[PDB]
Design a protein around this nucleic acid. Sequence first.
DNA 1: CCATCACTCACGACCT
DNA 2: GGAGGTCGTGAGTGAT
Lengths: 287, 314
Amino acid sequence: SKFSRENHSEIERRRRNKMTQYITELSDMVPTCSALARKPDKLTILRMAVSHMKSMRGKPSFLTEQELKHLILEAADGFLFVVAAETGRVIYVSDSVTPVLNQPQSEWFGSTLYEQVHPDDVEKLREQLCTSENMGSRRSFICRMRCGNAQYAVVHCTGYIKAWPGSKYCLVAIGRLQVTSPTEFLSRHNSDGIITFVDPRCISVIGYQPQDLLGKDILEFCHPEDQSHLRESFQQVVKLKGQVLSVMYRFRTKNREWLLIRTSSFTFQNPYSDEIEYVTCTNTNVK
Amino acid sequence: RSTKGASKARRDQINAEIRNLKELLPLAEADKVRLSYLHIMSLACIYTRKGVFFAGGTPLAGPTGLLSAQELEDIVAALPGFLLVFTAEGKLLYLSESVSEHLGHSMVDLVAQGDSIYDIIDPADHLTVRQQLTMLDADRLFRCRFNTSKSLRRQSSGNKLVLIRGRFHAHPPGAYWAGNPVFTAFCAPLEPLFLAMFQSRHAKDLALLDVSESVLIYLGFERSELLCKSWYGLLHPEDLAQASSQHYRLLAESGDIQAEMVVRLQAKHGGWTWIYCMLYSEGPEGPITANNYPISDTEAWSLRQQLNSEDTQA
DNA sequence: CCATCACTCACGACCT
DNA sequence: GGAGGTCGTGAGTGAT
């Protein structure tokens, strides 16, 4: 036709534009050059580039064996330690122990890993450091490590046993933090009024702990004249198939006082069986 | 007068410095020969950024002379994902070889067209990704589809899902590093050691017919104590509506539907654990199979922003 | 070996 | 004069 030539024009255009943008990204991110305002000769740009590409080292791979190390240790958040197998003495630790465990890096150096862990886990930690020739050189264990600032954090460690290139063997490992994270409180009840779950906000509003209320009828904490009213309200909530009902009654605190509480409740039904998984109750201290 | 033979030397000089770069680029000469000049000038920038970012930082490298023969170059093969490092504007700094297993395309193959993360991932996710790279909280986890191979497009149903877990790091003193932090991330595929998962099997009312035995690590419950318990009985009352609507969607006049949700589950001793939950139907009105991924509150917030924007743009 | 749209090289006039 | 970067066009090629 008439455009089997001018499309080629803009194709070569986009190619030249690609390389202009790239040679600019080289003209921003090289140290021997970023120290000017006069973007120099493009050939000199590539020449400072080859200067900075004669800087460090590295059949092949991309980066050297201290880059991948920093990277795997930052992706797998946590610290890397190196302990002697038999004595448990800490030969080496990375600085990342400070943001993970809050202990200064000088307190890990020299001490034994048995001091830094929980006493019940000490026998388990020994079991994994014992070199009896049990693929089979990698170790993986979950323990409780002492936090700095009683104070312990669960740490999942993965490493391997290596002869150091009585400390004929040493475990080189990485420890990840297995994080996994007023006026009202929520509670969950079954069809019968038996408390199945309590928000720990109850400690502050009524003074009871969660397990102090689990498994008891909600009416054993209601005030005798208000039992009938609460029982009828529960019975209606069961029939209201998701509607929110609201009732007011006097609740018996842990110091044996009577607090006025406004409870808003509705059933939760399962989308397939329509059975009452529980009655959700938001309890608000009103007076 | 005569611009030929004069303007030629310029081109054959810059295209000799390009060539003196490609013979330095840390690749193998099985592919160092099929590399366009455009690749060299789009692939050596990544190496140069790696160099300037790393050579310009305190020796915070964890160990010194421990993993010092090939073990660091061997654990990378056994990790269930691929390393990915880039700047907040999307320009890459490193992509381990391992990507060849997970997307079916080599490092020499993906980034050969362009410089940035947005040349590898699907253009349908570009918004979402950008959101998570602009939103101080040194943690960010978001789920994203990457472009795949033609060798695995013949065997997988499209472009791969990948969980991306990473954090923005302390940038080095520099000119382009100024105002542009560097995001280092572990990226694992979700369409089948650091990748925390306990798996579960639910019936048509989300009752735990079975669970993986690693649940004890992340919930404190043995598998014995969880069987046939109602999943809505493990949830946090705030996440009720999210799980209920996802359960409705999962129960339709057909099967084979993925259902994504970020929820909280109550542990044995009562701490709430953040679970990214991928429910799929291994059959229409058959079984329910759920992949559970424990995460941190930061990561849960990021993934929730993802899914909120996604349901917004439906 | 021979078209085909598509890469990806090189070229020589021709501005800033 | 003398760099140094661009542009529309010609051609060599790796590919289904």
